[PDB]
């Protein structure tokens, strides 16, 4: 079996992509954020505390004939930004793009943090990391991807995210019309339950490629591209007028600048991020200063190939028993 769904940025900055997901019977369609940096599928529901629900669409497990309570079970998760939700657990039918898993654990938020309440476009998350990151207790639950893999034509999924444009999530096959040349695959470490890999080096603009191992995570659920302080500093020394801003938190540049391109190494292959992708946008509407899309991961603790890097490529997540990550230009 296979699935195909369209994924659309939540705003004109491409901060996040949401994809529709059909949960229960009959189907309630909820717009989820597919996040390769976590492993829970949780959604706003009829259990959610009413003053923390805004404009979101909710799951009501009591209107689904296939819903069952997973008793005993609760979950509580916190994200890189300090945001959080918790609640209890049902199993139910969930379909993406036509691909149907039954007995998928759908985590029901009882409570959600201020940032989730404020985000009217995201009714919850679908985690795509390894299931050893799942928050449900006392037994952890499989992600959608792991439940799907028995029936998939190929145990894979691809991320084809758009720049200011929709894109696609496919499950179970690789669309060979979606990219150009060939996919380079690199090995994935699951030690810390992420899509973790090591890029082989970098170049700024038309300058030389520097062979250097950069271990990071591919994380669809992170907007920007978080690199070690000294690579990011070599990047922004090429845009005159770029400076680090304590106020705003990161490198900022004039919006008028033509930014250079950034290349990152995947094995012997090279993926080039156009410089207009690294122009996140301006730091306030009308402002003449823009925020950069390449920043330090020094206070993170870990390098993150986020949406700005991933949307430059066609990415295959190879979920075989030894997993790998694949990258093609597009």
């Amino acid at each position: 079996s296979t699935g195909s769904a369209t994924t659309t940025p939540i705003d004109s900055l491409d901060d996040a992509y949401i994809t529709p997901v059909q949960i229960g019977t009959p189907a309630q369609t909820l717009n989820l954020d597919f996040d390769t940096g976590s492993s829970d599928l949780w959604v706003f529901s009829s259990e959610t505390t009413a003053s923390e629900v805004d404009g979101q669409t909710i799951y009501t497990p009591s209107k689904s004939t296939t819903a069952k309570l997973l008793s005993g079970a609760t979950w509580s998760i916190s994200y890189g930004d300090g945001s959080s939700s918790s609640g209890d657990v049902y199993t139910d039918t969930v379909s993406v793009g036509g691909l149907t898993v039954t007995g998928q654990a759908v985590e029901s938020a009882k409570k959600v943090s201020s940032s989730f309440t404020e985000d009217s476009t995201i009714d919850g998350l679908l985690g795509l990391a390894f299931s050893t990151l799942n928050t449900v207790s006392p037994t952890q639950q499989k992600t959608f991807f792991d439940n799907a893999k028995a029936s998939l034509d190929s145990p894979v999924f691809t991320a084809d995210l758009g720049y200011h444009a929709p894109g696609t999530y496919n499950f179970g096959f690789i669309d060979t019309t979606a990219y150009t040349g060939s996919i380079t695959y690199t090995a994935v470490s699951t030690k810390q339950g992420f899509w973790e890999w090591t890029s082989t080096g970098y170049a700024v603009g038309s300058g030389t490629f520097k062979s250097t191992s950069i271990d990071g995570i591919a994380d669809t659920g992170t907007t920007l591209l978080y690199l070690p302080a000294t690579v990011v500093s070599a990047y922004w020394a090429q845009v005159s007028g770029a400076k680090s801003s304590s106020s705003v938190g990161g490198y900022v540049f004039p919006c008028s600048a033509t930014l250079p391109s950034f290349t990152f190494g995947v094995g012997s292959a090279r993926i080039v991020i156009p410089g207009d992708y690294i122009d996140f946008g301006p730091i306030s509407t009308g402002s003449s200063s823009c925020f950069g899309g390449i920043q330090s991961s020094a206070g993170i603790g870990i390098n993150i190939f986020g949406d700005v890097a991933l949307k430059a490529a066609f990415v295959v997540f190879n979920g075989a028993t030894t997993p790998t990550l694949g990258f093609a230009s597009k």
Partner: peptide, 8 residues
């Protein structure tokens, strides 16, 4: 603004 949804 920008999102950091790795789990931490």
């Amino acid at each position: 603004x920008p999102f950091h949804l790795l789990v931490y």
